[PDB]
């Protein structure tokens, strides 16, 4: 009968290293259709979104054939972050700012100390006898923006420590709101400029048919629209039953799903002594989580009318501040060995320990 | 009759791009001689000092002919800051520490993110097909001193957050006074050394007659002695009538006067692919506002006997801290395109937004 | 009679530039055997340990002959810090955490701004006509670890400023204890890795008989076991009698003893235009005081059962934070003149002034 369906379905779905995580998807419908208790939904909906935040980033580079590298360049970093955009809007509209303030932070740390620190250790052992070099000038424009990102986080934090100023809490707490809803346009203009610089000004250095190819970016985002409602709506009741803090599930365990394609798609290229691509994945994804996914959520709240600023807290800011400074001194010469990467791993386990202990409301 | 006066007056005064801002000068005498209300004096005395903080820096490089580049090098950065030295002493002696603590700060930010960030954007569009390079080694000695400047600002800030120490306010607030009056000699010795390094040790890389030439640096500082009394003595009553905060007039609008020659004398040289000079203007002026104009005002107060420390606040320090770090990563390779400059502009509009909103005593 | 003793004793003991500081040693026994008042013991026991924290680092490089550079490399930085390890355990077991929290900090500052800043000034004047260059790649691995060290100090500081969290003091003060006893294993694994990187993976770039040679590392540590009990047990009563603060004796005057061999063993090599060795002494000693002597004391307390965290305070952290950032921009090109060194000296006198004034319990 239909001959376009027999082996093409073998070409799209099953051609991946995570074949066994698939049939835990319909049970998360079936347990929710039945009513099995809420931590058992949460255990499956972080296993039902690993081969869907990977079989979407597979289906970006098989959509550069019909559209060209101009559109196909932009959809690289767009659909590799097609989980944080789903969750950090389903959580904003459900009064749970906590998760919108950690999951958009936990993808900035995981794209800087675990996507990146593993792809220097786990490549530097393979190419220890060869010599490794990368392109500096591709990864200097990214740290300019991450310091435009950080200063927008620093100033609403320090307004909260102006208790001397003869102002109450409800006077200063709407001074953190008005200047965060105004930094968000200045963050968007320094990303729409960053596309023009990359896709038009400096383009010097910086299988499956298409009628079916659009089809598995229709359905396999809709299941991510379903298995993000189940994560967000039941994260309280599945943190009591494990005695993990919600500032550990939202900042560590949940940014393993959202960077499950940016991780095994970067340890591909670390073994080939091509660190230019495992710096275009690790850094070029953290910028959009810095400067497009964050200052769209501040606008989306303010269009809806929900109190949300850029205040992440005093403890979260020091971790984001050191991660940008340690990453800059690691990359400032263009030659890599493995000890540059083991230091980035152990500086991520420090962030895990401080947020594992912190059992505090 | 006098033939030395006819066209020489055309040579000195009128030869500038700001011919129309001149006849707003005598009205600021005439309205003050009459008694027109105080915001109308303040509107003219920031227009009467744009072509006088430019027609003095014109009359420095026409005084290198008779004196040589040894004296003529030092008077470059001396008389381009011949407005901040006038105002930040007329405000210290009038109980208005606020302006002495912002105008000496607003010239450190404007010499790092608006003098400098415009002269990479507004040159990088002109020379986008050519290639731009500068000298790193001229602009590494300047960032050593700006980190000697910052640490002298960090420690008196953190003494104010030692409320645990079993000490009152009036015990700690004279511990911020004794260590700020003692950091100021250590800041002066690392600038008198910086002149010797530049004017004597490493000199490898680093029209109008003179009897009339001294004359228009006599009078055209005396009018700056007059139109600085009118700015300082009437800045309160001309901030109520506009509902701008005095931490916005003293930190943004007033550092457009004091850097009106350092700005159009740096966008001259950005178009010639000579960025070595638009880094000797942008950085070499911020060091003196860092390390000579600030630690002379701490001494001048203490000789007079007026309580003034180096405490600028918690909100002002984070802006000064990021501006030194973002400027260092912008300059660390010696090749410029325009996207290095648009990031420095938009990181100055963040400082404008946080101080436009802050309507707080 | 014994011929192995006559001139060999002249070879071991007296062959040093500090012959006159020796006979102040037995008086510190004799005054303690008599009972002369306690500041007179403290004045001698910082003079009895200058030619013993030098005549031990002499007797390391005369123990590379029989053991080879594999063992003899490790004993360089081990016995040059054979005073801080003695004092910061004799003070931990005597309830005086103050000194364990300053002396392990005052050797991180003195190995970065006074061992290092003098060996660029006091060499750069000698070789001002020659040109000075060093190896960058030897001194990039050291700043990776010092930022793994700093972040372990930043997070227990900021837990103390979470008074909003609906938690008391005794709830948060054991959250600073549990995460400091857990960062200390992650600090040790990134130093045992640093030995393997140096002593086995990248060994490309990075007189006296031995039966007597072991003998003068037996006795001349035992006197350092004696003259460290006399410093620690009598530092209170010899700070009242001078009106110096104990946060000045423990952070300045006492880190002149512990870096008395790392100082005149680095100004040896600064005059020979060999700055590769005066960066392997200044930086390679600060890493062990960062990442082995500190996270062993946190374990040693916790094995004994004594409340000690990594909290050093808010004032001490800013000095440690700027010292790592100013040192990185000084070394980022591999060419030195003297003005890079005078800036590091005067940024150490700022730390002296802030802790000379601070007369506060």
Swiss-Prot record, chains A, B, C:
Region (Cation selection): 80-115, 258-293
Regulation: Activated by monothiol glutaredoxin GRXS14 and CXIP4. Inhibited by excess of Ca(2+) and Cd(2+), Na(+) and K(+), but not Mn(2+).
Extracellular side: 33-39, 92-104, 162-181, 228-250, 307-309
Keywords for the protein's UniProt record, in alphabetical order: Acetylation, Antiport, Calcium, Calcium transport, Glycoprotein, Ion transport, Membrane, Transmembrane, Transmembrane helix, Transport, Vacuole
Domain of life: Eukaryota
pH dependence: Optimum pH is 7.5 for cytosolic pH.
Effect seen on changing residue 337 to A: No effect on transport activity
Tissue: Expressed at low levels in leaves, stems and flowers.
One GO BP: intracellular zinc ion homeostasis
Effect of deleting the gene: Plants exhibit a 50% reduction in tonoplast Ca(2+)/H(+) exchange activity, a 40% reduction in tonoplast V-type H(+)-translocating ATPase activity, a 36% increase in tonoplast Ca(2+)-ATPase activity and an increased expression of CAX3 and CAX4. These plants exhibit altered plant development, perturbed hormone sensitivities, altered auxin signaling response, lower sensitivity to other metal ions and increased freezing tolerance after cold acclimation.
Membrane topology (Cytoplasmic): 60-70, 126-140, 272-285, 331-336
Glycosylation sites: 243
Region annotated Required for interaction with autoinhibitory region, chain positions: 1-5
Biotechnological applications: CAX1 expression in tomato increases calcium content and prolonges shelf life and may serve as an alternative to the application of CaCl(2) used to extend shelf life in numerous agricultural commodities. Expression in potato tubers increases calcium content by 3-fold without the adverse effect of increasing other metal ion contents.
Recorded GO MF terms: calcium:proton antiporter activity
Region (Required for Ca(2+)/H(+) exchange activity): 30-38
Membrane topology per record: Multi-pass membrane protein
Subcellular location: Vacuole membrane
Recorded GO CC terms: calcium:proton antiporter complex; plant-type vacuole; plant-type vacuole membrane; vacuole
Transmembrane segments: 12-32, 40-59, 71-91, 105-125, 141-161, 182-202, 207-227, 251-271, 286-306, 310-330, 337-357
Induction data: By cold in leaves. Highly induced by Ca(2+) and at low levels by Na(+) and Ni(2+).
Assembly and oligomerization: Interacts with GRXS14 and CXIP4.
Family assignment from sequence similarity: Belongs to the Ca(2+):cation antiporter (CaCA) (TC 2.A.19) family. Cation/proton exchanger (CAX) subfamily.
Purpose: Vacuolar cation/proton exchanger (CAX). Translocates Ca(2+) and other metal ions into vacuoles using the proton gradient formed by H(+)-ATPase and H(+)-pyrophosphatase. Involved in ion homeostasis in association with CAX3. May play a role in cold-acclimation response.
UniProt protein name: Vacuolar cation/proton exchanger 1
Full-protein residues shown: 58 to 436 of 463
């Amino acid at each position: 009968g239909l001959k376009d369906f027999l082996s093409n379905l073998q070409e799209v779905i099953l051609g991946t290293k995570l074949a066994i995580l698939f049939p835990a998807i319909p049970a998360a419908i079936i347990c929710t259709y039945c009513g099995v208790s809420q931590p058992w939904i949460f255990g499956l909906s972080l296993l039902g979104l690993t081969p869907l935040a990977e079989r979407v980033s597979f289906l970006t580079e098989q959509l550069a054939f019909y559209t060209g590298p101009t559109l196909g360049g932009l959809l690289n970093a767009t659909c590799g972050n097609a989980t944080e955009l789903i969750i950090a809007i389903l959580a904003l509209t459900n009064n749970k700012v906590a998760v919108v303030k950690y999951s958009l932070l936990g993808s900035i740390l995981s794209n800087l100390l675990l996507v990146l620190g593993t792809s220097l250790f786990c490549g530097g052992i393979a190419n220890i006898r060869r010599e490794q070099r990368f392109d500096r000038k591709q990864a200097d424009v990214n740290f300019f923006l991450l310091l435009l990102g950080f200063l927008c986080h620093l100033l609403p934090l320090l307004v909260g420590y102006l208790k001397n100023g003869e102002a109450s809490a409800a006077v200063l707490s709407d001074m953190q709101l008005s200047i965060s809803r105004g930094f968000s346009i200045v963050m968007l203009i320094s990303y729409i400029a960053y596309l023009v610089f990359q896709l038009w000004t400096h383009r010097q250095l910086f299988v499956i048919s298409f009628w079916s190819g659009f089809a598995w970016l229709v359905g396999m985002t809709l299941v991510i629209a379903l298995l993000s409602e189940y994560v967000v709506a039941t994260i309280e009741e599945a943190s009591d039953k494990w005695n993990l803090s919600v500032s550990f599930i939202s900042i560590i365990l949940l940014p393993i799903v959202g960077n499950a394609a940016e991780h095994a798609g970067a340890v591909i290229f670390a073994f080939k002594n091509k660190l230019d691509i495992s710096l275009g994945v690790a850094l070029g994804s953290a910028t959009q989580i810095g400067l497009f996914v964050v200052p769209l959520t501040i606008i989306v709240a303010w269009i809806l009318g929900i109190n949300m600023d850029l205040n992440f807290g005093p403890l979260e800011t020091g971790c984001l501040a050191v991660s940008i400074i340690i990453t800059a001194f690691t990359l400032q010469d263009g030659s890599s060995h493995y000890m540059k990467g083991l230091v980035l791993l152990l500086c991520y386990f420090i962030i895990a320990i401080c947020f594992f202990v912190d059992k505090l409301p």
